[PDB]
Design a protein around this ligand. Sequence first.
Ligand SMILES: [Zn+2]
Lengths: 45, 52, 116, 94, 71, 121, 125, 35
Amino acid sequence: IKNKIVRQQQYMKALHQKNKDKLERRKERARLSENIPATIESKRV
Amino acid sequence: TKTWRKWHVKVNQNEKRYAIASAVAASGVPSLLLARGHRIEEIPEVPLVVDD
Amino acid sequence: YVKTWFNQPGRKLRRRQARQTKAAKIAPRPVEAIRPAVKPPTIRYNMKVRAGRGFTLEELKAAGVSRRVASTIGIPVDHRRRNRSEESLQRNVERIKVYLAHLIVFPRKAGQPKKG
Amino acid sequence: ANPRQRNKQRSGKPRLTRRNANKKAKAKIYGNFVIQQNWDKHATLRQNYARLGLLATPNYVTGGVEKLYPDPTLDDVLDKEISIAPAKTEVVRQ
Amino acid sequence: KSHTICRRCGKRSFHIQKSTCACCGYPAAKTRSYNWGAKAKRRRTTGTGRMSYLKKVHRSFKNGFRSGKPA
Amino acid sequence: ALKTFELRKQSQENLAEQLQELRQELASLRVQKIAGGSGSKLSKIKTTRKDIARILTVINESNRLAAREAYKNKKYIPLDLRQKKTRAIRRALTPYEQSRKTLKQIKKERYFPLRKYALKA
Amino acid sequence: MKFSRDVTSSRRKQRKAHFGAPSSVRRVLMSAPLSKELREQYKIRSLPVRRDDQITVIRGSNKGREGKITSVYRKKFLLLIERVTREKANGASAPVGIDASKVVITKLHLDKDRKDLIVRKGGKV
Amino acid sequence: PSHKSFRTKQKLAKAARQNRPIPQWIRLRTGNTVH
RNA sequence: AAAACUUUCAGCAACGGAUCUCUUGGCUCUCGCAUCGAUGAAGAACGCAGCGAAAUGCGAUACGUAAUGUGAAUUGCAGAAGAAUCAUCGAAUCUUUGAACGCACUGCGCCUUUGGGUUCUACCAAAGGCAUGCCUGUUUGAGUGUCAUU
RNA sequence: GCAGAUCUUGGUGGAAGUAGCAUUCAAAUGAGAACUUUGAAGACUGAAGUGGGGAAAGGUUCCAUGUGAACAGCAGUUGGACAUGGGUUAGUCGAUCCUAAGAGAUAGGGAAGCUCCGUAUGAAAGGCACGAUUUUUCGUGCCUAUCGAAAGGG
RNA sequence: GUUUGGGUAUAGGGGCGAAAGACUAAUCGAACCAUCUAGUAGCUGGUUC
RNA sequence: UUUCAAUGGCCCGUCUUGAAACACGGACCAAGGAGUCUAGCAUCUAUGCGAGUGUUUGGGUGAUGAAAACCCAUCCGCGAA
RNA sequence: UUGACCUCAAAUCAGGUAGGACUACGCGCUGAACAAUAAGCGCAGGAAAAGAAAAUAACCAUGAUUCCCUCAGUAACGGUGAAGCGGGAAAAGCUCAAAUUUGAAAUCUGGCAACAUUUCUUUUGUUGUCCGAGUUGUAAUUUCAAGAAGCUGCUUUGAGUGUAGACGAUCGGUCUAAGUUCCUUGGAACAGGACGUCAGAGAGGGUGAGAACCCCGUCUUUGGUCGAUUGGAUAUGCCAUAUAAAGCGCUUUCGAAGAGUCGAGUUGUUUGCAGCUCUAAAUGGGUGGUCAUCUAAAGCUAAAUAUUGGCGAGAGACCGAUAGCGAACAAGUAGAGUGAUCGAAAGAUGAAAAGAACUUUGAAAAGAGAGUUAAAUAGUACGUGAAAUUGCUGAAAGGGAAGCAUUGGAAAUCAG
Ligand SMILES: [Zn+2]
């Protein structure tokens, strides 16, 4: 959106929509063995 | 600002012809070409005239 | 109200192209018609000679050009002007005669019915 | 800036662009074929007429003309017949 | 309410009692307009709507308003 | 979908039965959209709508070409079959009558037309 | 220098025309050079990019990569080449767009139209 | 009120439905605005 | 008279949005051309996309149809595979309004033709018509208007 | 080229955290309960209601579900908020029809003119029947706008 | 201890004059809007290294 | 640079008056913000020419931006009584 | 009785046509306060209007209109303020009324019918036929510059319809030279260096940083090629109602010329024009100075000229987000008002969204590790990030002001 107020407003609606749905799945879910934080050391060649 | 500001300037046709004559004569002076900023340090002759 | 002149070089060019457009059409004949020589009407300018509007009926008749064919070959006619002296007559009669000598008139395609 | 110009600025329909303006382009010769074959499109019509042997105007010229190089009693005449005029150039002769 | 929606211009400027629009002068045949109202003119003049037909005409002019079909 | 050239190679009542069939298919597809459909059906809606438009276009042009044939070489033809350039152009003098001249002016241009000439320098 | 009054040298107009171009115009804008071998074989210096063409990335961080064009993204002036991707945080791969001028066409997806286009541009096939 | 012209029902519905959240996918297609 | 507090200075972090650079905008000048509408304009309203609110486009054939050109896209996702949210554009479509035209401003009429139905002297639907002034012609008239008719 | 114009626009201070703005118990729900919900107790309007309906007016504001960004001179699990969907069914009820005071086009007449006066006015102001068909060219007789009431008439 | 809802019509200054008429106004008393207008300044305030 | 010591130091602008003081403006910062363009006249200086002087109404001409530059027919302005 | 005609009606009669909008420029009308102004009203076009002398002049005369320069701040009028001449731009001229075709209404609309034609099945005609219009006058002929009618002997001539090719114009598609070699820096080479290439192209734009050689272009092009539609000529074919029509030149013959208009009186507006009363003439009438000049009361007319609008184009010693249009972005939008009207604020992540997976804390919003990136001192409250102002830490000062100046001390820190 070339209009700065509108692109900001849509982002805030997008951010709320994303955060709400991320925790909708998070509360539904509540894994540790598989999902581990990847770091630079783990990504070292 | 107005568009009828004076943009063009009158000059007597004699003074314009004077300045053009003075400009050509200055072009034939090697020292003025160097001060002008021309790299004519190896030009065979000033004024430089080539064939037709 | 201020009238500016920023279109002065533009007006100059547009008039040149109008002459070029006119010549593009009428290509061999001149872009201007031949004007007569008249003497300006006052004691301050009567010693001069300037261009008139057209040639008088008496001038054309002495030059052998009919008032109907004059316009066809580019000779304007001034039905209002008259020749009060023979000097005006001779000045413009010879102007027409010189113009005729330098003129090349191209023939025209005519209709010719088969019978009489 | 007009409402009618802002209308098509925000529009999706393309502008009706026409490309017709090329200054310095002199009108091409139709009319006479002999004049067309000998007309050089660069020159002016005064230069072209003089080169061809024709008079652009039969009247005085209202200004200075270009100099490119350093140039080196009723009855008798009312009755006289002007003996035509010479054809200077080839095109006039043609 | 002293004004209602005007049938012509669609603005809520149609005076009920006078039965006349204060904006466009409806139902007079001509539209209300004033030279002292320069901003009022630009608010409703040509270009403020669609100009659907004028855009067609402007587009048709270049070819000389030709009709028919291509070869 | 429906190709316009093979559509134009058919008769008007055949084009009508195809249009009726397509309108039924469109109605069924919009019923599927309200009941919960797949992307294929939702994409089929637009194609069917364009196919209806193509059939209607072919029917209308065939109808109008018949009207043009019926009115060919007639003094008066339907307004929608007449030219539509602008209102002003329709009111203008035709090139014929804009070129009408009196016999007086015809004789003038017959006997004294503008001549072709040139001036020798 | 440009001498035509039909072409504008204005930066404002040129950038508006570039970023306002329709897809048919961006199709010309998204052109790539032909490789040396293709150039001496077809007598054509450059061609518009078309899907399934075989190209080699010449410039950028992916200098040297090769692959087919999986999509020409005309609305962004981008070429998505197979296997030239970027690994997001979550593990999905986002294809990396390359400007058409930064690749070189090593093999063309020849059709009847492309052959007609080739011979049209003073070429040979 | 209640005895309302049908044009009013269309007029009221369109005015209200303008006040509606702009879709998420709408933003994803570059740009779309309010008002 | 230590701390707090107040002030000063420096550092960091805030608050704010100046500066700098930029710029599909504006403004000014010049040049070319002449094209709205009863064949319904300008304007207004309402609608239309697989997922759309504005803007854009379009009008129930509704982000378009035909035709011609280009030649393989669209793109946010899904989906599809002479493509296209492409260009050009000579064929069309073009709801309700508006000079706005049967009369009114949710409505109420008249005329012509055709059609439907599980019911046919009824009911229903469809299509095409019905404004004003003036002109030319046509037809039908009126007049204790001017006459002719053994 | 600004220190000032009770300068313009924006930003931010001190004043200043200042001026200020008839319920009780247990339970349930909730991360959270002075404000929600249920039960008990105590009270308030007392048919002139804080009751129950409509007109005009608003326009979805009705209902259900979700959320607790902005609202809330406090707050909320909360609002007439936000989001998502749903909801108004008529031969008999209203409009539709009629007229009212009045308005108003038409006929005409003014007016340089936008327009004004005028409403049966010095308007050719619209019908009905009859007939063996009448020189197969119609004779005879009779009678002579619209808008304005969702409270009037039906 | 006759008001009122909805719809409506419409004259609207002042003196002069017995009246009629006038003599200037008016759109009544006014209000609001937009242009004219950048009305009229011997004045106030400010006027930049 | 901060701070201390000793010494000195009345708030800036505006206005009024012989002069003050009043009085008016000033919470703070940033950005903006006021002798400009044009026509006429006059002086002085410079420049070109000089009993002359002034090309740019207009015409010619200008291929490399042609709104420039370059050229000047007839007039006319002022001066020379 | 029958029938002519006049006048006046009617029809959803056949076929047309008017309105409204735009309105920069143009022509009328109306018109103030302080200006043939603004506002108001009417009507146009691509230009409009004006226009072929009831014009100037006083000359050796000029010669429609318009426009520019000059005349000229002159004459006049009492500050207002011309015009003739002169120089230029562009140039083009004309049609009626008034005449007996009178040996012939010779003229025209419409219906129907064929036949062609087309920007076009959309356009435009032709031929025939019939009904009408028209003698209360339609053609031909004439317009004062003349002219008619006779006469004469010279010079003249198409309102056809094809084809061909050339020359122009408009539209649309198409054609176009040369590095992406080497090294360094960088996330990216378009930077620096090296070696080269093209240039009738070293304009501009794009591409991950300054790109003539990567791309679009640019130049060639003041053209090739392909169509499409046109324009005026040229050559040529066919047709041609010429028993015709013209120009010139001659006269023992003729020569019509516009009325409630001019004008006079008087009242308004500013001599022109309007009202009112009165109301002409025929070498008459108008206008200038006996003379000159012109010929009103009917009409058309290209170009030079104007153009804040319309459809486009090219530029700039212009503005650079408080500027430039009110509006660089949802801009006449949100919003306000019963209404006429009023009317903003608001541009910048990055090369790429790669827009932060995953773990943990929290009810959640978020936080913290982590991750992407050249960079998060780029996290959408996103380029740079000033000051006012605020919190924090450090240092110091402080008994009812503070700022400041001077001189040094102390502490800290610089040249050194
Ligand atoms: Zn209205």
